[PDB]
Amino acid sequence: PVQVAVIGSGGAAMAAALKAVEQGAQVTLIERGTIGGTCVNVGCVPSKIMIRAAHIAHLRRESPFDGGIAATVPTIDRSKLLAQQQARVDELRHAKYEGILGGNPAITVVHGEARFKDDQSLTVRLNEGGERVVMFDRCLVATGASPAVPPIPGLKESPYWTSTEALASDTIPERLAVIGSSVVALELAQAFARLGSKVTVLARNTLFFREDPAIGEAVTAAFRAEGIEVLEHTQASQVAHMDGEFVLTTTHGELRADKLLVATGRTPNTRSLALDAAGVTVNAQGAIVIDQGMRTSNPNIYAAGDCTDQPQFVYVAAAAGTRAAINMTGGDAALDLTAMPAVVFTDPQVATVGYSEAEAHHDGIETDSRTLTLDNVPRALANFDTRGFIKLVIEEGSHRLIGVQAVAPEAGELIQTAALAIRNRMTVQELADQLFPYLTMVEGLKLAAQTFN
Amino acid sequence: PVQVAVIGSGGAAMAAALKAVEQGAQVTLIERGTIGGTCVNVGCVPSKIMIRAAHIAHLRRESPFDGGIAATVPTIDRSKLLAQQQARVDELRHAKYEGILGGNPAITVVHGEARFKDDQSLTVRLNEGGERVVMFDRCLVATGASPAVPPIPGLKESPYWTSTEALASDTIPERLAVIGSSVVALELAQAFARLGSKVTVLARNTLFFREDPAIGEAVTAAFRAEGIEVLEHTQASQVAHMDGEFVLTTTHGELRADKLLVATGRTPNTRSLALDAAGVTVNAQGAIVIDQGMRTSNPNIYAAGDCTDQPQFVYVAAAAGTRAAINMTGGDAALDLTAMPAVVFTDPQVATVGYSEAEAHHDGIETDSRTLTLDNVPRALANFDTRGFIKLVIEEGSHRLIGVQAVAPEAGELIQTAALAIRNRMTVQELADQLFPYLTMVEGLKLAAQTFN
Ligand SMILES: Cc1cc2nc3c(=O)[nH]c(=O)nc-3n(C[C@H](O)[C@H](O)[C@H](O)COP(=O)(O)OP(=O)(O)OC[C@H]3O[C@@H](n4cnc5c(N)ncnc54)[C@H](O)[C@@H]3O)c2cc1C
Ligand SMILES: Cc1cc2nc3c(=O)[nH]c(=O)nc-3n(C[C@H](O)[C@H](O)[C@H](O)COP(=O)(O)OP(=O)(O)OC[C@H]3O[C@@H](n4cnc5c(N)ncnc54)[C@H](O)[C@@H]3O)c2cc1C
């Protein structure tokens, strides 16, 4: 049987292992740490749980209906919340990862750190000690990424937090400074603020600097409306820690906080791989270079997930691994990200799919667009919360919907309707023609579509 | 210009008026009461607002995270809530109805009650007094419906509530009895319960008796989990009112409550129309009989909305009126309800589209189905609330998705993705192939689709 080696056990690796076995191949999976990788252990799952707890805390503290419903500062026991959060994480790890790895004897799991010995084998330093060599006909690298650490003087020697330490924190800091303006930084910034922290975010430029500017504007306004300080075009030139608190020298003067979260990005995990030994090329960022079929410069070796330059979402990583497994077992598949949705779990949520106006123009596409602010959406008016918008981008000539960006509660739910419309190459007229439920957020897609006439 | 007469000013009438004028016709619109009709004044809008207030009150009282976040019985001031609710209703009536009727001089608005004088004109009893005859080449009847009143001995002489009185109530009754098991009955039952009332629902059979049974089961369990008493296969044989309270004789013994809501259905408003004078036929229920193009037995007269047998949703009524206006002005349009979504704003919400298993079988269609309970949906597990399910129905032969029924938070948002898939005649395999955001409720559609293999 085809010997397939898989480094890692996150979404990308898991998808590949199961698919490879499904294709009759013998799989040897090597994991240096906890089975399940990032998403289930220190990523998606724990963060979303903390965000939901934050949502309840926020609504107990305030709402658009406080005129007739009394609100109260909720007493928070982070230690109990943490315990509940961890129990759920453990359950999911067992059920969908460990239990699945053990549910396929065809998959041999090796606990140790792997690195290429040469172009046809791996050397694994076993956790228990000693070494083992794994031969392979095909190998998939799915090592994921790790939190980036900016070279700010004094930061390296302070006890700062990365998303991992923040999610595992058993207490809510009185004051939390956050360096970064990325999805991770903002999701956690708002979660902690709602759980009781006085949060100050330091963004080098503006929030969601790589996205359509209307997004960063809506999120910024949202954050400030609930007491979160957002310092745009701000950086920390020095970090110090004394007497139980961090002291940051910033463009806005001295900022002090009990805890410091650093979330400026995630760099691929490729140093402990000796990629050079197997002829696998990496770009400037350290990301393993791959083609449409996840193939690396070494045709027998593939890469998928966060260790590549692919969008960092678990469903993109899983989709990449499944297809990688197909190509490693004779198949011929490719990853299509045309209708790929992206969601940011802040409140309101951010959701996108397809082209933004700027992206389309940069690629020489003539478009037209309509931005429907939520004060024009029945559901938003009925909830007395109109922050946000639903933006539609179409190809000027044919009026085909090619992109949608939204900042609104339930944005992550409605964005899937948009993704499907784009997948089915629908025109905004065709979409507006469909019957939508009145007083739902997704109805906003229809209303926005109708403003093109 | 074509003289078009429109009776009513709700969703159906409004859509027709604007469309008729858009087609160069002279429009005379007759309304006996408040402009805007049911949805904006005493229906969708006020009910959804009350339900949102109920949502905040409920989450302040309890949540799956109460182990780490303190909850408190919120003090409710229904009078203030009512005032806020009414102000929003008034604003919407002005903006999207009155302001629109006055924004088209081509539309003449007559405040009075209309009835057919003959097959070519209407007699209108003006509110201010006196009479006026309106000649027409074409006429659209969009009179809507009214709350049904069951013939329960003693009910007629008691001061019971219909949805209108309940929505306009300035106080939260300590105990509220509800007769009915329909969308309206249940939406209000849960809203009042969450706002403080001890609610008891009397359902003749089971909840959502006309829908797939899994729906009534999930909703029933939800209601009981929060203290709402649901008496199945129960009826009131006698209603009395004394000493400030209602006394009901029921299959479960004597039930007492401070207020009584009767929501057993809505009957079309056709008695004050003298339909016989114009040759317009009505069925047993009193609903004006119409064809695919909204035409009545009298080709020059059309009907749309709640006064017909069409599904009672404002977007169905509006869609019916627009098309009616097209046919009254020379056009040739038809109303297609194939991918019509339906939403019930309880919590969790109920949402459906297309065929249910039973419906498909009754129509001689061979199907297969999969029911994914929410304890299998990542988002539900992360929120520690797994009540509900997502059910998919497919045509056995081709595996084309032909129906979806769901009971879950945000069901009304995810149902639109399903509706689009059905519209685009997608197979469950094709739907499961699409990339969905992880930890969103709509992801449940993909997960359910995947269980067909
Ligand atoms: C705080 C946070 C929140 C997030 N929220 C979301 C979200 O809501 N939705 C979403 O879609 N994505 C989210 N993501 C991103 C998502 O977690 C990742 O994109 C995804 O987990 C990456 O999967 P992967 O398989 O590529 O890598 P990973 O899951 O990161 O795992 C790689 C694995 O390989 C192991 N490994 C590395 N090197 C070696 C070696 N030499 N030998 C053996 N094992 C090795 C690692 O230890 C690890 O277990 C979030 C991330 C973070 C950090
Ligand atoms: C409590 C409640 C909640 C609801 N929630 C939703 C929801 O969330 N979503 C949804 O899609 N639907 C909902 N509906 C239903 C929706 O309100 C109706 O289907 C829709 O309003 C019907 O519109 P229509 O134009 O057919 O009739 P209507 O809006 O009912 O209006 C008919 C109009 O004609 C007038 N009229 C009648 N007879 C005469 C006459 N002889 N002369 C002059 N004028 C006359 C009436 O006074 C009225 O203004 C709800 C209904 C209720 C009662």
At how many degrees (to 10) do helices A183-194 and A213-225 cross?
20
In eight-state DSSP terms, residue A9 is -
Q: Quote the Cα angle for B399-B405-B411, to 5°.
A: 125
**How are beta strands B253-257 and B245-250 bridged, if at all?**
antiparallel
Considering only CA atoms, which of B227, B184, B209 is closest in space to residue B43?
B184
Q: Cβ(A383)–Cβ(A64) under 8 Å? A: yes
Q: How far is CA B299 from CA A4, B16, B120, B286, B310, in A?
A: 72, 16, 11, 19, 19
Among B57, B339, B445, the residue with its CB nearest the CB of A69 is B57
Q: Tell me, yes or no, if B338 comes closer than 8 A to chain A by beta carbon.
A: no
Q: What is the Rg, in whole angstroms, of the alpha carbon atoms belonging to chain B?
A: 23
Rounded to whole angstroms, the Cα distance separating B264 from B268 reads 14
**Using a CB cutoff of 8 Å and minimum separation of 24, what contacts does A250-254 make?**
A250/A202
Distance A144 CA to ligand 1 centre (A): 5
Question: Which residues are within 8 A (CB) of A49 and not within 5 positions of it... i.e. 6 or more apart?
Answer: A84, A85, A88, A89, B382
Q: What SS3 class is residue A305? A: helix
Q: Tell me, yes or no, if B386 comes closer than 8 A to chain A by beta carbon.
A: no
Termini Cα distance of chain B: 60
Q: How far is CA A90 from CA A11, A154, A363, B441, in A?
A: 16, 35, 45, 22
Q: What SS3 class is residue B245? A: strand
Rounded to whole angstroms, the Cα distance separating B425 from B79 reads 49
Pocket residues: Cβ below 6 A from ligand 2: A 438-439; B 7-13, 30-33, 37-39, 43-44, 47-48, 113-114, 142-144, 163, 184, 269, 272-273, 305-306, 312-315, 317, 345
Output the six-digit token pair for A422.
Answer: 């784009």
> What number of other Cβ atoms are within 10 A of residue A79's Cβ?
13
Among A44, A68, A383, the residue with its CB nearest the CB of B439 is A44
Rounded to whole angstroms, the Cα distance separating B345 from B51 reads 8
Rounded to whole angstroms, the Cα distance separating B293 from B280 reads 15
Question: Which residues are within 8 A (CB) of A236 and not within 5 positions of it... i.e. 6 or more apart?
Answer: A152, A155, A177, A179, A202, A248, A249, A250, A255
Q: Tell me, yes or no, if B441 comes closer than 8 A to chain A by beta carbon.
A: yes
E strand or H helix that includes residue B50: helix B44-61
Q: Quote the Cα angle for A12-A15-A19, to 5°.
A: 140
Q: Quote the Cα angle for B160-B162-B167, to 5°.
A: 110
Question: Which residues are within 8 A (CB) of B321 and not within 5 positions of it... i.e. 6 or more apart?
Answer: B11, B12, B13, B14, B15, B16, B17, B19, B140, B142, B294, B304, B305
**How are beta strands A253-257 and B121-126 bridged, if at all?**
unpaired
Q: Tell me, yes or no, if A67 comes closer than 8 A to chain B by beta carbon.
A: yes
Q: Tell me, yes or no, if A80 comes closer than 8 A to chain B by beta carbon.
A: yes
Output the six-digit token pair for A418.
Answer: 């948009």
Cβ-defined contact of A45 to B414 (cutoff 8 Å): no
Cβ-defined contact of B319 to A414 (cutoff 8 Å): no
Q: How far is CA A408 from CA A216, A390, B338, B389, in A?
A: 12, 8, 29, 25
With tokens 């003006």, the residue in question is B126
With tokens 């005032």, the residue in question is B83
| Chain B residues touching residue A413 (CB < 8 angstroms) | 410, 413-414, 440-442
Give the mutation candidate from A50, A420, A443 for the B interface (greatest B CB count, under 10 A). Answer: A420
Window 247-266 of B: residues touching A by CB (8 A cutoff) are none
Q: What SS3 class is residue A78? A: helix
DSSP letters, B355-423, are --HHHHHHTT--EEEEEEEGGG-HHHHHTT----EEEEEEETTT-BEEEEEEEETTHHHHHHHHHHHHH
Q: Min CA distance, B180 vs chain A (Å)?
A: 23
Q: Tell me, yes or no, if B209 comes closer than 8 A to chain A by beta carbon.
A: no
Rounded to whole angstroms, the Cα distance separating A88 from A40 reads 10
Ligand with an atom nearest the CA of residue B165: 2
Output the six-digit token pair for B364.
Answer: 């001689």
Rounded to whole angstroms, the Cα distance separating A202 from A182 reads 11
Considering only CA atoms, which of B259, B347, B343 is closest in space to residue B54?
B347
Rounded to whole angstroms, the Cα distance separating B46 from A405 reads 30
Q: Cβ(A382)–Cβ(B84) under 8 Å? A: no
Termini Cα distance of chain A: 60
Question: Which residues are within 8 A (CB) of A219 and not within 5 positions of it... i.e. 6 or more apart?
Answer: A186, A207, A208, A344, A346, A348, A350, A407
Considering only CA atoms, which of B88, B44, B55, B38 is closest in space to residue B346?
B55
Among A69, A80, A379, the residue with its CB nearest the CB of B76 is A69
E strand or H helix that includes residue A230: strand A229-231
Output the six-digit token pair for B216.
Answer: 């009534």
Q: Quote the Cα angle for A346-A347-A349, to 5°.
A: 65
Alpha-carbon dihedral B274, B279, B284, B286, rounded to 10 degrees = -40
Q: Cβ(B257)–Cβ(B240) under 8 Å? A: no
Proportion of chain B in helix, strand, coil states, percent, rounded to 5: 35, 25, 40
At how many degrees (to 10) do helices B78-93 and B44-61 cross?
150
Cβ-defined contact of A74 to B74 (cutoff 8 Å): no
Rounded to whole angstroms, the Cα distance separating B154 from B179 reads 14
Helical H segments across A246-356, by residue range: 314-328
Question: Which residues are within 8 A (CB) of B42 and not within 5 positions of it... i.e. 6 or more apart?
Answer: B163, B164, B167, B168
Q: Tell me, yes or no, if B412 comes closer than 8 A to chain A by beta carbon.
A: yes
Question: Which residues are within 8 A (CB) of B362 and not within 5 positions of it... i.e. 6 or more apart?
Answer: none
Q: Cβ(B47)–Cβ(B188) under 8 Å? A: yes
Distance B222 CA to ligand 2 centre (A): 29
Q: Write down how long chain A is.
A: 453
Q: Please name the amino acid found at residue B264.
A: T
Q: Cβ(A130)–Cβ(A292) under 8 Å? A: no
Among A413, A417, A439, the residue with its CB nearest the CB of B44 is A439
Homologous superfamily (CATH) of A1-147+265-338 is: FAD/NAD(P)-binding domain (3.50.50.60)
Rounded to whole angstroms, the Cα distance separating A29 from A4 reads 8
Backbone angles phi, psi at B236, to 5 degrees: -100, 125
DSSP letters, A398-443, are T-BEEEEEEEETTHHHHHHHHHHHHHTT-BHHHHHHS---TTSTTH
Q: Cβ(B371)–Cβ(B408) under 8 Å? A: no
What was the experiment behind these coordinates? X-ray
Q: In what order do the strands lie in the sheet with B175-179?
A: B229-231, B198-202, B175-179, B259-262
Q: Which part of chain A has CATH 3.50.50.60?
A: 1-147+265-338, 148-264
Distance B318 CA to ligand 2 centre (A): 11
CATH topology of domain B148-264: FAD/NAD(P)-binding domain (3.50.50)
With tokens 């919120």, the residue in question is B74
Q: Min CA distance, B415 vs chain A (Å)?
A: 9
Considering only CA atoms, which of A321, A333, A288 is closest in space to residue A27?
A321
Cβ-defined contact of B45 to A441 (cutoff 8 Å): no
Rounded to whole angstroms, the Cα distance separating A17 from A273 reads 19
Rounded to whole angstroms, the Cα distance separating A313 from B289 reads 53
Homologous superfamily (CATH) of B339-453 is: FAD/NAD-linked reductase, C-terminal dimerisation domain (3.30.390.30)
Considering only CA atoms, which of B73, B75, B71, B80 is closest in space to residue B49?
B80
Rounded to whole angstroms, the Cα distance separating A249 from A238 reads 5
Specify the residue with its C-alpha closest to ligand 1, atom 37.
A143
Window 283-312 of A: residues touching B by CB (8 A cutoff) are none
Among B382, B420, B437, the residue with its CB nearest the CB of A45 is B382
Cβ-defined contact of B383 to A52 (cutoff 8 Å): yes
E strand or H helix that includes residue A26: strand A26-31
Q: Write down how long chain B is.
A: 453
